[PDB]
């Protein structure tokens with residue numbers, strides 16, 4: 385018999401993104417080639433099958449630095465990290481291939497699905 | 507020119523609640539009288555003006571245990587912690603006074619607003 | 629607020 | 633997915 389606040393989840397994600405922009409309570413650095421991205425492990429886990437597996441590992445759960453596969457493009461990762469914290473995906477003709485490949489590696493199934501749909505249309 | 511995934515924020519919150527239920531990456535214990543509640547500082551901050559202030563404090567940000575004011579009712583806190591992680595509020599005739607008082611202390615303005623509305627109707 |  |  386609960387009541388529900390429609391905007392609650394969106395408001396929570398908005399505040400988590402504000403914490404990310406201000407580097408508050410960030411507990412991991414994701415290294416992608418020469419580039420570094422600060423984030424919250426819980427948000428990464430909630431969005432990605434790969435980060436979910438990494439941070440549930442009894443040894444990796446305690447690492448402050450995670451290095452991604454050298455094939456991963458920093459821009460594709462940046463676009464996906466922004467999507468994790470906002471629900472908004474900056475999908476463009478020039479980045480769609482790198483975004484799909486990065487989403488497949490990160491195991492972000494809904495992003496992979498829209499990338500496949502957008503590629504099929506063109 | 508971004509696209510948006512409508513269910514993303516709700517899915518993120520659902521996964522954060524799954525992490526809470528399994529005690530994964532929880533980094534704080536909230537003590538309410540004899541009762542203890544494990545949670546994620548970032549989720550508490552995103553939902554509550556009080557926790558936002560506590561965990562942005564350069565000294566309190568590093569505490570693993572937070573003791574609430576002894577006037578705070580553990581059931582009211584439990585109902586509000588569940589709401590933080592689900593968007594669902596178990597508001598009942600028998601708990602509405604304790605829920606409103608706890609939401610005022612925690613600075614959860616939308617919960618305070620619906621409690622005032624529900625009390626006014628009766 | 630809604631009835632979910 | 634939508635146009636926000």
Ligand SMILES: O=C1Cc2cc(Nc3cc(Cl)ncc3Cl)ccc2N1
Nearest residue numbers: 429430431433436491492493521524
């Ligand atoms: O496409 C995706 C997105 C995703 C997110 C998560 N994260 C969780 C899943 C569960 Cl069941 N509980 C907790 C968490 Cl944090 C796992 C796999 C995938 N695949």
Ligand SMILES: O=C1Cc2cc(Nc3cc(Cl)ncc3Cl)ccc2N1
Nearest residue numbers: 399402551552553555558613614615
């Ligand atoms: O009723 C409420 C709910 C709430 C949440 C937060 N948390 C944040 C606010 C901002 Cl601007 N950036 C980041 C965070 Cl985590 C503060 C005050 C209140 N009052």
Ligand SMILES: [Cl-]
Nearest residue numbers: 492493494495
């Ligand atoms: Cl996804």
Ligand SMILES: [Cl-]
Nearest residue numbers: 614615616617
């Ligand atoms: Cl609220």
